[PDB]
Write a protein that binds this DNA or RNA. Structure first.
Ligand code: K
Ligand code: K
Ligand code: K
Ligand code: K
Ligand code: K
Ligand code: K
Ligand code: K
Ligand code: K
Ligand code: K
Ligand code: K
Ligand code: K
Ligand code: MG
Ligand code: MG
Ligand code: MG
Length: 1319
RNA sequence: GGAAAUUAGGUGCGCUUGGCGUUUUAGAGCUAGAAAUAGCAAGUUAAAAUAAGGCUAGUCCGUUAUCAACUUGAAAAAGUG
DNA sequence: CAATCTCAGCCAAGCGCACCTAATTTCC
DNA sequence: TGAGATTG
């Protein structure tokens, strides 16, 4: 008889075996190998430790990058093949010189000057074209016949770096405002604007923030204000999106953005509300935006050149040359003794480090700004710097804004210019344009041919896919359909039927009727509330749901029960405020087709379901139009144009065959039929498919993975999923240890940034239109502080008082929990606010008082509309106006502190339960031999603090094993004391439930001071009430737990793992004469070309062999640890001997090769242990088993901040000698197994320095000292403010004669190999 | 313990794309001096690589998951205290 | 040799599906 | 946190 306790974490699985007396057993286990030791005694408690499991995301991002480098290469190969025959007539080695440009001259097969193959022509090219954009601009505008090699380089540069695809359609640069002003002055003939003299080009295209440009433009318009209509429109032409609610005295918020796909719909929404006479105002705003859309990237007049992008880069180049000549002359004239640092020293962030060194543009500006401010004549240079427009390069981080249409424009222009002289450029013009513009649809995927586990594409024809034959060779329709269909759910009720689109008309009829059919109404005179009949439900649908997008309860009472039913008063149940379901698609299609009778005709049901299916399945508007033209004769061509733009996303939970297909046999009605009319029963969906008097249930019944696959497919972090599979393996081994007998119980407990924070605040403050970010700038790293993070999430205001907060007074403010943390265990931003004083929340019993909600609800709404607070947060802030926290609400919160509700933890329980319990009884009911109990961490956590079983994580890893043990003790004792709780904890009025769950753990204590201020007494022996079984002896059982937590022998096992992943560090270092760098390609010798550093060792191998020594190459026997790198692993494993001989080894003892992955364990002298960090470095392999009296002392001494704390404080004073006893424990342990006397001396020296410090502070910093003794990799630590650096063990020689220890997953089964016998 | 709907927030898997960086080479450095050097001039660009590579040869695949030892088995697996 | 210093690929866009948690209505 | 280089 025994039970198993388990603690499942992200990097550990604790485990323990207990008997019915809560003792941990011990056994003699056989010891295999070749050593003196035949057996060993081990306690049945320990913890498996492992490195974190990783998601597949990084692997995915690298797989994408590989495909894009491959495809970018093919774009160039496509272009070169087109140029191939004609280039062979101009220069038969031009493409060869390009391919070998990387090679040193000695390795080159052709002349070293790539473009022209001789130095005079090469020098002359760069003289005439200092940048490629000079050549691109020349080839666009000039009419001369150009060298075919220069044509290629210009086109290749555009194709290789082609710009983004975020803008759909065609772009044609062309650089109006006087017309829009004249337009507004017509639509508002009584209130005209005068824009005479307003330089609209300079004000709006200026570099500053758009909020400032808006102010600059409005400053030139007297009588107009920024939040006026015209002021709000200026943002629409600029690219922002303001709200026009107050401009038109609207009731609902309405915004507009030109770049969004819903602009024409939101404009139709606004124009249908304000009057079509305003169409010309948004029309002139859209006409102005076309000419000023590329003003950020096209800083050049478009009438002077057809290559404004390359012209803009030449502008960067020219201003760079002018300003560099200026800067040099200034420094030479004023600060001559700083010229060498600025323009020669690459190590400094001056111009030299900017051009030749590793200084970025941002680092160069920071270095040079104080130099400019100190000197005279740097007026314009300072302005360019603060505009981030000084001495700019052309290839820069901000070129991501360039759309591919801009590069396409110059590409097309060069082709038009030069096709007049080269016939092949005319015949391949559209082919070349296709190379630049073609983009593999994301709904097609990799263009594979049966060897990619990621691909789904199918081909119309079996031939190579090119950018020019893609539409003909690839079946886009079937591929796009497969893309979705391989991922969408099937109806769990009819597993062979696909679910409907979420926006299907039938699906929304189902949702509306399912909700409607359970509404009840009662009026004065009715005996009881009545359901709605079929005629009443149809009347409500036709009258309300088919005329309003949403249906409120007020509309139901006034527009149906009053007008139709002639009820003055009526009470409604089954719906609150408004109906949740609605016929959204019905009103979408009504506005598009403008034919209500068509929508209401049931004959058109199949057509409308296929239309919405097409709109949901496909995203490409042209594929949608293609799939819709079977119905083109049904609609006006203008309607079809709007129909193809109406796209939907998302799928429902049920199939069409379920909701309106299968029929009840006796009635002949489908499920939707019953929802529309079901006599006076009004059975809903759940009732219909569970009713034995209908045939839906039986038809759904007649329609109805390995362990690793099952766990892998679970939802949750792949980190926690690693511990789940390891937990199952730990349990399997423990059962085998206990003679294949299964346990009585298994108690499981499962443990519970700066980039996104800056984004939520930037997006939120922009939504509010606040200038808090300009008044108080921040960095993404500063928002890690929770008080400063709350300051910006609240726009610098108090959440409980309508007042500004002081950003320099955050230390005096309070961080209060919305729902008091005494009820719920939420310390996240969603349950915290920043207030001046927490007392202003109201009372501490409940949610913030009603008075606070009445004052701050509107302010909270603006934060909710800016995503600065979540809906769950807003609902918790405002819960007082809905009764606050009810007595039931308090009982649920305290219950959820005990009963684990996470789905992932239930899956672990289910997994263990279905593996332990496999038999069935006479009634074919499962026989639950093993009870799987789930506990929350707070249960054992409180048990530790209540009975002085304290935990200090930094001391060692034993706390994982102790946690699992206490889980088993508390779990079994709880189920023994209260067997009724098995429904809550075993897999398989309101005040009373609150008081019950509040005192569920009281049976452990002897004296209990409850909340009501009373003292209860319980006997030393707690028993179950029904049986006579004793469950807890408050004398001997606590002592048994104390003996367990003090046992020094705990099986801590670091899981040995082969290392996988990248071959090495990714940096390409410069060439060096070392043999440490790794070639980037087969023939790229790092002595000439540089290469990679630091290869990752996959595992090490023990090699007993001979190696040649000296010029004579005489053979000498060696025993060595050889690191097999990740890149080498496949070759080594394919033939180990040939691999080792290629490394220089001879006469390898083949059967003595031992594979030694990372963390392989070795024992040396005096119990000292080491783990392999690699082939050349070791990790610490021992655990410091600090006695329990010292662990409890450190906990109480470090946590100085009931009145019984005096008794705890007193115990600290009487045992102040424990501080020196702990230092001696650390010293003796370190002198035995750590062997870092330099650091240890600095430890003892730092400890003697701070013996005058308060005892709490000394106890806090002693906890840091255990970093020296911790298991695993050495790490730096500090004692008070003395930093002690790590001592690495960068030699593996000593383990070659030590004892190698192979451990099973629990560490109970050992094989020990004495390596000194090898050699 | 489940189901649908509504509202909101998270996570996973997969696909298609943009911009940098880095590396080697190309962009004639000049003058004085035997040289060491010194005084100047110059700098913004490009090519190519971006896991070595692989066979299945695709505009495909190559960094996740999973792994003590021993025995029998190539392998898969099973077994051993 | 040791003690000590030094270094580590990054930023961005769009799209699809499937899960999970947490409050609400209605049900099994 | 392994490992390359520099300093002692
Ligand atoms: K050569
Ligand atoms: K004004
Ligand atoms: K550089
Ligand atoms: K630089
Ligand atoms: K560059
Ligand atoms: K509602
Ligand atoms: K769609
Ligand atoms: K038509
Ligand atoms: K791995
Ligand atoms: K890893
Ligand atoms: K192991
Ligand atoms: Mg790229
Ligand atoms: Mg490649
Ligand atoms: Mg580049």
């Amino acid at each position: 008889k025994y039970s198993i306790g388990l603690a499942i974490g992200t990097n550990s699985v604790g485990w323990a075996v207990i008997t019915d007396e809560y003792k941990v057993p011990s056994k003699k286990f056989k010891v295999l190998g070749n050593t003196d030791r035949h057996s060993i005694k081990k306690n049945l408690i320990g913890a498996l430790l492992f490195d974190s499991g990783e998601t597949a995301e990084a692997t995915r991002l690298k797989r994408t990058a590989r495909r894009r480098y491959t495809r970018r290469k093919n774009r160039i190969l496509y272009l070169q093949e087109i140029f191939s025959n004609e280039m062979a007539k101009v220069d038969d080695s031009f493409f060869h010189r390009l391919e070998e440009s990387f090679l040193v001259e000695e390795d080159k097969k052709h002349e070293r000057h790539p473009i022209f193959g001789n130095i005079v022509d090469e020098v002359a090219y760069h003289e005439k074209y200092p940048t490629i954009y000079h050549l691109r601009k020349k080839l666009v505008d000039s009419t001369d016949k150009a060298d075919l090699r220069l044509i290629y380089l210009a086109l290749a540069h555009m194709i290789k770096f082609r710009g983004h695809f975020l803008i759909e359609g065609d772009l044609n640069p062309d650089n109006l405002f006087i017309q829009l002003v004249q337009t507004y002055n017509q639509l508002f003939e009584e209130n005209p604007i005068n824009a005479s003299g307003v330089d609209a080009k300079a004000i709006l295209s200026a570099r500053l923030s758009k909020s400032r440009r808006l102010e600059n433009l409005i400053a030139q318009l007297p009588g107009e204000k920024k939040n006026g209509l015209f002021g709000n429109l200026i943002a629409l032409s600029l690219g922002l999106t303001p709200n026009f609610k107050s401009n038109f005295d609207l009731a609902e918020d309405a915004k507009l953005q030109l770049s969004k796909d819903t602009y024409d719909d939101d404009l139709d929404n606004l124009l249908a509300q304000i009057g079509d006479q305003y169409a010309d105002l948004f029309l002139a705003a859209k006409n102005l935006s076309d000419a000023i859309l590329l003003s950020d990237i096209l800083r050049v007049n478009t009438e002077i050149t057809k290559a404004p992008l390359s012209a803009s880069m030449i502008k960067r180049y020219d201003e760079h040359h002018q300003d560099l000549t200026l800067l040099k002359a200034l420094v030479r004239q004023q600060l001559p003794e700083k010229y060498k640092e600025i323009f020669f020293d690459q190590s400094k962030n001056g111009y030299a480090g900017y051009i030749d060194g590793g200084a970025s543009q941002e680092e160069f500006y920071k270095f040079i700004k104080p130099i400019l401010e100190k000197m005279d004549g740097t007026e314009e240079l300072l302005v360019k710097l603060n505009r981030e427009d000084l001495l700019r390069k052309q290839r820069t981080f901000d070129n991501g804004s360039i759309p591919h249409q801009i590069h396409l424009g110059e590409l097309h222009a060069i082709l038009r210019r030069q096709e007049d002289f080269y016939p092949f450029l005319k015949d391949n013009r559209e082919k070349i344009e296709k190379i630049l513009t073609f983009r593999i649809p994301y709904y097609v995927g990799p263009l594979a041919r049966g060897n990619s586990r990621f691909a789904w594409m199918t081909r119309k024809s079996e031939e190579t896919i090119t950018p020019w034959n893609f539409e003909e060779v690839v079946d886009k329709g079937a591929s796009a359909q497969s893309f979705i269909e391989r991922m969408t759910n099937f109806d769990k009720n009819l597993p062979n039927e696909k679910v409907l689109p979420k926006h299907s008309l039938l699906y929304e009829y189902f949702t509306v009727y399912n909700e409607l059919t359970k509404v009840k109404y009662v009026t004065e005179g009715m005996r009881k509330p009545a359901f709605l009949s079929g005629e009443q439900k149809k009347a409500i649908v036709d009258l309300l749901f088919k005329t309003n997008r949403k249906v409120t309860v007020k509309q139901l009472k006034e527009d149906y029960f009053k007008k139709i039913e002639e009820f003055d008063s009526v009470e409604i149940s089954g719906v609150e405020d408004r109906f949740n379901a609605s016929l959204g698609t019905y009103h979408d299609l009504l506005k598009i087709i403008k034919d209500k009778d068509f929508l209401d005709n049931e004959e058109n049901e199949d057509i409308l379901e296929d239309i919405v299916l097409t709109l949901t399945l496909f995203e490409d508007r042209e594929m949608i139009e293609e799939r819709l033209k079977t119905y083109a004769h049904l609609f006006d061509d203008k309607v079809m144009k709007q129909l193809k733009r109406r796209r939907y996303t998302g799928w429902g939970r049920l199939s069409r065959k379920l909701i309106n297909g299968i029929r009840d046999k006796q009635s002949g009605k489908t499920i939707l039929d019953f929802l529309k009319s079901d006599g006076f029963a009004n059975r809903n969906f759940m009732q219909l498919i569970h009713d034995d008097s209908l045939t839906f249930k039986e038809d759904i019944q007649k329609a109805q993975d390995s362990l690793h696959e099952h766990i892998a497919n679970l939802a949750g972090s792949p980190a926690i999923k690693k511990g789940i599979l390891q937990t199952v393996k730990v349990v399997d081994e423990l059962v085998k240890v206990m003679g294949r007998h299964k346990p009585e119980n298994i108690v499981i407990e499962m443990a519970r940034n700066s980039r996104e924070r800056m984004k939520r605040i930037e997006e939120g403050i922009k939504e509010l239109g606040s200038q808090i970010l300009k008044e108080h700038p921040v960095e993404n790293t500063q928002l890690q502080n929770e008080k400063l993070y709350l300051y910006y999430l609240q726009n610098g205001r108090d959440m409980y008082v309508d007042q500004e907060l002081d950003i320099n007074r955050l230390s005096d403010y309070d961080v209060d929990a919305i729902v008091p943390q005494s009820f719920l265990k939420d310390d996240s931003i969603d349950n915290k606010v920043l207030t001046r004083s927490d007392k202003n929340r109201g009372k501490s019993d409940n949610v913030p008082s009603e008075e606070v909600v009445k004052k701050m609800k509107n302010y909270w709404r603006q934060l909710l509309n800016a995503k600065l607070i979540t809906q769950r947060k807003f609902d918790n802030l405002t819960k007082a106006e809905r009764g606050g926290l009810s007595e039931l609400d308090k009982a649920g919160f305290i219950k959820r502190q005990l009963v684990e509700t996470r789905q992932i933890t239930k899956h672990v329980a289910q997994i263990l339960d279905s593996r332990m319990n496999t038999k069935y009884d006479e009634n074919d009911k499962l026989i639950r031999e093993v009870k799987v109990i789930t506990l929350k961490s707070k249960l054992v956590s409180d048990f530790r603090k209540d009975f002085q079983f304290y935990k200090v994580r930094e001391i060692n890893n034993y706390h994982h094993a102790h946690d699992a043990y206490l889980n088993a003790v508390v779990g079994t004792a709880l189920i023994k004391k209260y067997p009724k709780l098995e429904s809550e904890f075993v897999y398989g009025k309101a005040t009373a439930k609150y008081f019950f769950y509040s005192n569920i753990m009281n049976f452990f204590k002897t004296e209990i001071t409850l909340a009501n201020g009373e003292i209860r007494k319980r006997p030393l022996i707690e028993t179950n009430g029904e049986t006579g079984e004793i469950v807890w002896d408050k004398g001997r059982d606590f002592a048994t737990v104390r003996k367990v937590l003090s046992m020094p022998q705990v099986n801590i096992v670091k899981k040995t793992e082969v290392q996988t992943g990248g071959f090495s560090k990714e940096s390409i270092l410069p060439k060096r004469n070392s043999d440490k760098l790794i070639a980037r390609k087969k023939d790229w010798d790092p002595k000439k070309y540089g290469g990679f550093e630091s290869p990752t060792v996959a595992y090490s191998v023990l090699v007993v062999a001979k190696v040649e020594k000296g010029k004579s190459k005489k053979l000498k026997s060696v025993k060595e640890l050889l690191g097999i790198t990740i890149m080498e692993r496949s070759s080594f494993e394919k033939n180990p001997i040939d691999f080792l001989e290629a490394k220089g080894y001879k006469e390898v003892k083949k059967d003595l090769i031992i594979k030694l992955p990372k963390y392989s364990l070795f024992e040396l002298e005096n119990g000292r242990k080491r783990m392999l960090a690699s082939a050349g470095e070791l990790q610490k392999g021992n655990e410091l088993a600090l006695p329990s009296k010292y662990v409890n002392f450190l906990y109480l001494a470090s946590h100085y901040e009931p009145e019984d704390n005096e008794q705890k404080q007193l115990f600290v004073e009487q045992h102040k000698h424990y501080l020196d006893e702990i230092i001696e424990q650390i010293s003796e342990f370190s002198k035995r197994v750590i062997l870092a006397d330099a650091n240890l001396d600095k430890v003892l020296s730092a400890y003697n320095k701070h013996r005058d410090k308060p005892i709490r502070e000394q106890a806090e910093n002693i906890i840091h000292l255990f970093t020296l003794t911790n298991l695993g990799a050495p790490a730096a630590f500090k004692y008070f403010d003395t930093t002690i650096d790590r001592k690495q063990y960068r030699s593996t020689k000593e383990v070659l004669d030590a004892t190698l220890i192979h451990q099973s997953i629990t560490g109970l089964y050992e094989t020990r190999i004495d390596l000194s016998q090898l050699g």
